Amino acid sequence: QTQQLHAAMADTFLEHMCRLDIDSPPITARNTGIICTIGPASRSVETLKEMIKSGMNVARLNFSHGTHEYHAETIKNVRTATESFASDPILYRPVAVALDTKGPEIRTGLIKGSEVELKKGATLKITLDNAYMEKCDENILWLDYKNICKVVEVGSKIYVDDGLISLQVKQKADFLVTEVENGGSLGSKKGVNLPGAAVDLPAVSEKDIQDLKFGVEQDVDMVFASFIRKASDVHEVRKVLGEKGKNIKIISKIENHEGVRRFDEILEASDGIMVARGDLGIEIPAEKVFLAQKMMIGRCNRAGKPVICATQMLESMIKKPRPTRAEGSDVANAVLDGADCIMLSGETAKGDYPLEAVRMQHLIAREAEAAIYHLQLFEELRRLASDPTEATAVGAVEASFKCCSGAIIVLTQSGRSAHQVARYRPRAPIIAVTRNPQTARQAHLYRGIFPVLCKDPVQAWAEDVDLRVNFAMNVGKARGFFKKGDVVIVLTGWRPGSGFTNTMRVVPVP
Amino acid sequence: IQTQQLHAAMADTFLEHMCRLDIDSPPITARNTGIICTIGPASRSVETLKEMIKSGMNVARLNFSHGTHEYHAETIKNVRTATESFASDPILYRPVAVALDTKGPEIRTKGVNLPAAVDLPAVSEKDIQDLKFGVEQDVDMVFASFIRKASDVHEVRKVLGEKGKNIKIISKIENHEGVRRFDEILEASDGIMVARGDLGIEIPAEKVFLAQKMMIGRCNRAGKPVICATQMLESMIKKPRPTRAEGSDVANAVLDGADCIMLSGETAKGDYPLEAVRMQHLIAREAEAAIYHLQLFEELRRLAPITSDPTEATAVGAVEASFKCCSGAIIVLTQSGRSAHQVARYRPRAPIIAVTRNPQTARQAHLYRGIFPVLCKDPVQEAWAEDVDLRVNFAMNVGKARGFFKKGDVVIVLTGGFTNTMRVVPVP
Amino acid sequence: QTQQLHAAMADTFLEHMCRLDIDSPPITARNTGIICTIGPASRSVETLKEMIKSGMNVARLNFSHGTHEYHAETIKNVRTATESFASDPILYRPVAVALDTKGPEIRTGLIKGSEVELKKGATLKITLDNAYMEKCDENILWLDYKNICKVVEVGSKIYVDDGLISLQVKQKADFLVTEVENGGSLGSKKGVNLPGAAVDLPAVSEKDIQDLKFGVEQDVDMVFASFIRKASDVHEVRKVLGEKGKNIKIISKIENHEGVRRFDEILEASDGIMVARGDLGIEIPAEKVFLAQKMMIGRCNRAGKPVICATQMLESMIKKPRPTRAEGSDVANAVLDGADCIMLSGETAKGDYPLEAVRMQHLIAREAEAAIYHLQLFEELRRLASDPTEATAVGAVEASFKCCSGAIIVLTQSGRSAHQVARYRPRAPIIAVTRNPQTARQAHLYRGIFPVLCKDPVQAWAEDVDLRVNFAMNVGKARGFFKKGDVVIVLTGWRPGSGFTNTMRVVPVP
Amino acid sequence: IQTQQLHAAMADTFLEHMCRLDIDSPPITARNTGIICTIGPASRSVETLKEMIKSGMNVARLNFSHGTHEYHAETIKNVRTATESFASDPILYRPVAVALDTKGPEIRTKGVNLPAAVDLPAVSEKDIQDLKFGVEQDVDMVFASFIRKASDVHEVRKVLGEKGKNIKIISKIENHEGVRRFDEILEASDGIMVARGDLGIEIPAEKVFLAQKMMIGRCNRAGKPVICATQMLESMIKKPRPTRAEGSDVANAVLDGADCIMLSGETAKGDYPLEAVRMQHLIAREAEAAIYHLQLFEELRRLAPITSDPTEATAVGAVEASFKCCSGAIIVLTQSGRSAHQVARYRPRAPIIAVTRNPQTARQAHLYRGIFPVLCKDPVQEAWAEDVDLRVNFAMNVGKARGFFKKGDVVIVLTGGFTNTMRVVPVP
């Protein structure tokens, strides 16, 4: 039988796992969103067309590097590739654009162009003298945190390049003499972490302000805000986006100890969360990252807010055409944890197999979605959760289970009722029909929402509803979600475009 | 405190649910469990039957183990005179069903039980006579005595013929073979009576509660009506109050999941028929508020088969929504009753207002817990959408007049085989 | 299969009931204690021998009626009957003696000996003039509550004879003029209830003091204290029993609204609870009694303290040789609720079939014990519940399930470790071996404890333990609990007679 | 805060359990999951093997897909030299097991996978040679490559003979047929390796986690050891820290229920063998504290078959008691290991100190999660009761010296096939 349906009927979680079947094929519809960092390997229009075909739902632009002119061209190519499919509204896939801020990063300078291997036990002077900012080598290392001497002490550890090189402070005015603990090849402009230090860089720098206002002008759908430590950090990003930017979603990136400790107030202020595991796993012990990941996904699921699992998910795929077994496991387990979206960074921005990495997240996510123990998840989501709109949504999810429906079709202007359905994690895909292009793009933050953009003019109320529902039916049939004779759940508002989404039909597919 | 045992309803375990049951938490919801009253010399007058209806009678049982066709036809006539005396206000009118209880294979001198493989026929030549008479008297339902096997049911069914094809067949289980072959009997029947009088002589009396709970559970799982019957308030044949065991029996039958509870000698020949009806009404209402819906609905939901029926999925979705928003009712437009039946098997706390123009559907709906049938007599409007909303406003008026809900409260409305549309709406 | 074992394995309570099987026979051991009120129908030595044979575990003496001389003779006969079996310690069944107080009862006087039918709508004067205390009839009714006029008002209802006759106060100094609501035949010395009135009789009257001190002198095992309203009532009974009576168990009878409202403080002060449904169902609406019963049994189960379901359980059996179907249901449901004991009053004290009533409670209780959904009960008792002694007990209950043991054998001086095991409601009987005769009698308050009194002298520690365990083995084999080749759980203290009951063996039966 | 994730352990649902996981709740209990390290050029020296043991190595895997019998015998010799360098303090001595991993039916040029019904034999003539050599080298366990069917296991078993009858046979599942026939393979085997390298080439890589979780679950339910293997920390072959996916994989294998986790190239040939061992140790300890025992033990308890084995009932009773009193250890005297194995399958939080005089039992106990084997070398005392308590005091000394518990703490002691006696005692 398909869909891991045999495992779905188990009465304990242990027997659920015992019943998982590699010969039970999944449905077609892949529910977990796939966010791809764009860069030199993926930014041509022709490659972006294949990215979209392969599964990309959100294009991430990392403003830690690059110029506004460069990112504007990348965004233009994303939209050219996306709109090349706009001819057929039945098959068109909305693609969202995300701006990922630099935030309070610390980076080294450029290595002398005349790369450097740091030898364990060797000495290294860190300098703040900008005279060396492009002459870094094995003896003098410039970095850009001007206040570093005030927050580090003798004994402190300084981590460089994804925490792979470690230094220990031995002498501390405008310099630090360090000893090399774990060495390696030092490159240019590498990230620096000071775990346990009270780094006093601003949450929103002058550059961040410029990048955020640029994002408003470029009509980005969401911001991934780096190094959020507290609710007031989020409010500062909110203020910069301002009223013109009021509909841009703010995803707070949790990647240091304070952001974990203050997670609840951050989540309350944010539209969603990134588990930003790269920095997180340097700021806190690497063996604790999985606790923070499962905490955050759980609390986001409890709150009904989007959560993204990010970073090194398919890392080896930067150089290889197939992932390691731990990478296959990591993607599957993030989906089983409850992540709304999964992300690729260097695998799509700069590696040799960007399309293969997207395709692999698609395949793994689909298999893992079938393996979800919906009986326990749905029961716990219901018990831990009312107004009429919530009741209609949970009623639609139960009806979809009762008839193993091919889809839950939701007519929505802002996405809210589609979000409410997604919160209970139905097995069936949620086809969200909207006339709002921004709603269609932003919907990808939510597990299981397949947004479709209706271009037809407003009809004649009852005919206009029937138009959009029949649109969703054509979408579902064309994409292989269901066929004539299947059953679908349809959700609508009381009238017009009401937020009082209170109407459910159970409809055979003609 | 909180009314309706909602403190206990929110408990996370069944044990904590019990510990929170509160004698000072008043019931609020209307009474859901049907009350079947055997009519006899003590209750067959028109004036008494009016008070029986006012006190809570939903079904009149006529026991064809005694009496004459003419005596029972006069009783039926008086039942319908009393019932129709309220027909002038359709908002308040309560349909009342008529049940024919067969004689079946009795051994009499007077009754003799051989607890033995008795080969008397389930359906005698007399039995077919009374069954054909019930068809002529337009009864809503047959309680068939001493059913032993599915072919016994099929006989009663085929005997009732084409003209009685809509009459509900309730098999009475009251011997050991009926218990052994219960599954095939249930599949063949429209419902079951746990006929505890004979059952407790045919099998050891200490085993009756096992058979009762087994049968109620299996009927609940199948979504078919089950009646708990016999000696539930026996001491009230002579006394104006029941014993503590009798109060407990009625409450536990409701907690078990019985769709209906029944009175026999207590109403047919006893000295306090009206008090017996009123006591079953009071206990049922208290016990219904005590039901641990959090577990019951989840188990019924879990064990529901996956199907493609849109009405079935709508029903379970509607009951789910009714718990999450504490709706004042589930309003269901239904011709045959089937879609309201599908809602009732998932056991909502909220009352099910079933709007029908079919009088037999309205009477037969009393077999199902929580269904409050209302008989719409307005002509069928020309535009369907207008005829739909006429019937919905009727239900809205019924619920406000009977105190089920008030203007502004949230209710759930099910319309169209297909009953496939749910709207969660404030009461206008 | 036996023991409702098929129903035991169900994964939902609904399927558990669906699987209950009238052709699945129970084990032999009946766990629920059976308390029998002794009176003219059951007080001869020869009848008491048959009471014990039929299942009686506790003899209840109701001090609402009778003289000390009369009750002393009854207690003597109980002990003669009980000790007639002392010849064989393997088969001897300890029998407890309970004293049930009169408490703050209100009763009418004696009807004229020259019984009275009260006519609905007829007038009735209640008098306090003792001149009429033995001349009651259809016009003048004496009763013994001297302060009644101060606590009842015009409109009040007065209930007589098990609440079956009701009167309404129409005129109120030392008299009350009433109207007959529900009439009936009025007899002598009938109980009177004033629901909603603030009856101001003492919790412990001068007569109660005399009866309680008499109970100490007669070495009764427990007191059933009538009309307990609050913890301080219980303390007053405690004070009267005093230090000589300190080991007598106080069972508070809950039978009015205040006792229900103040149940937690009463339970904390008491050794156990009676659900005294006769008065309770007159003091509060009869349709609410089942709520109070299930509340109290649940909270006693949660607390691990004995709870008794009492009154009218087999009422028709006073005159008939078989019970009604509602009576069969009531006994079964009290066991399924969790009652440690069930009780008979008029059925054994004065009816025509005392032995048949005992035998029927035995048969029903055994069937209902097999029908318990142990999977849910055990899980809820564990989750809602540690020191070493508790851990060893819950460990012994789980081991008994794992091997479907024939018994849990517990060596105990005061009963405590046997009580702790009983709290988790094992299926297997608990054979409690004691050398303390009072412990052996009092153990019957606890579901599933089969007390056996060891008469052998102390041995030589390890040999003395082995002696008492082999005693329990002989008991179990002789009574049909288990056979050679079965498995039993054995519980002992660390040494000697330690309360630190911390040792468990799993033992095949030789 | 509270240590050991006890805040999350007390959650009433799995979702709330996850939401309470706390990076600031330090682990306290010793590390339960066994760590299997493939030995090769990077780790085969005596000095390196000493550090591998200190860092957490419990099992040395020798891969007979490469190398010579003489090269592997020298590695074994160095393993035993490093292990026995700690033998002077039996209180602290850690037994270290030796595993032989067969070549099996490989296609090489270098490996070739035909994802095809390949008819190469599971046990070649070479394979029987290496297996007989393992018997001569006194290995504790065999990891048999490319097991396809139960008769493959039976061959390895029968080949090992009478003299190798005590060697544990771990079937490696790494092709589609082994997954299809898993049930018969498990029944025939002493345990399972989830051999993900080949498995993820033989079946689609996106399906490996299904097979992994299926196999771990079924092994847990059977109480037989299961190993998660291959590429768990692959990037540490060249780097001193793992990737975030690698940290997650190790944690999730432990949360899944794996008895052991394993390192291959990371320790056999990589640049950071010791760091890889230390990282598996750190992650396993953190993940073990995160296990939701409230659900896991109840499900294992529920699915345990009813049997008459006194040791089985004692084991489940002991684990139950260990949760209820938060014991510092479960101390088990065992000759064969079987009674400690029976305790470990119910997954106590508390460590299992298994006291044995049998050296092979002590080494083989590392296949089972939570078993801390301690090798008693005192002579067998004359009075049994004295010899018992000698071994119990040994375990008491071990636990105090290793920081498992301290004087006054409560522990659970299991003695005697029968291990049928439980005592819940304070540590002396």
Ligand SMILES: O=C([O-])C(=O)[O-]
């Ligand atoms: O910023 C990030 O994406 C990270 O550190 O994982």
Ligand SMILES: O=C([O-])C(=O)[O-]
């Ligand atoms: O026929 C009946 O109703 C019975 O026997 O209970």
Ligand SMILES: O=C([O-])C(=O)[O-]
């Ligand atoms: O006192 C009693 O036993 C009663 O009222 O139930």
Ligand SMILES: O=C([O-])C(=O)[O-]
């Ligand atoms: O043999 C192995 O260990 C594998 O393929 O993973």
Ligand SMILES: [Cl-]
């Ligand atoms: Cl439709």
Ligand SMILES: [Cl-]
């Ligand atoms: Cl023994």
Ligand SMILES: [K+]
């Ligand atoms: K009649």
Ligand SMILES: [K+]
């Ligand atoms: K080697």
Ligand SMILES: [Mg+2]
């Ligand atoms: Mg970062």
Ligand SMILES: [Mg+2]
């Ligand atoms: Mg009958």
Ligand SMILES: [Mg+2]
């Ligand atoms: Mg009383």
Ligand SMILES: [Mg+2]
């Ligand atoms: Mg391999």
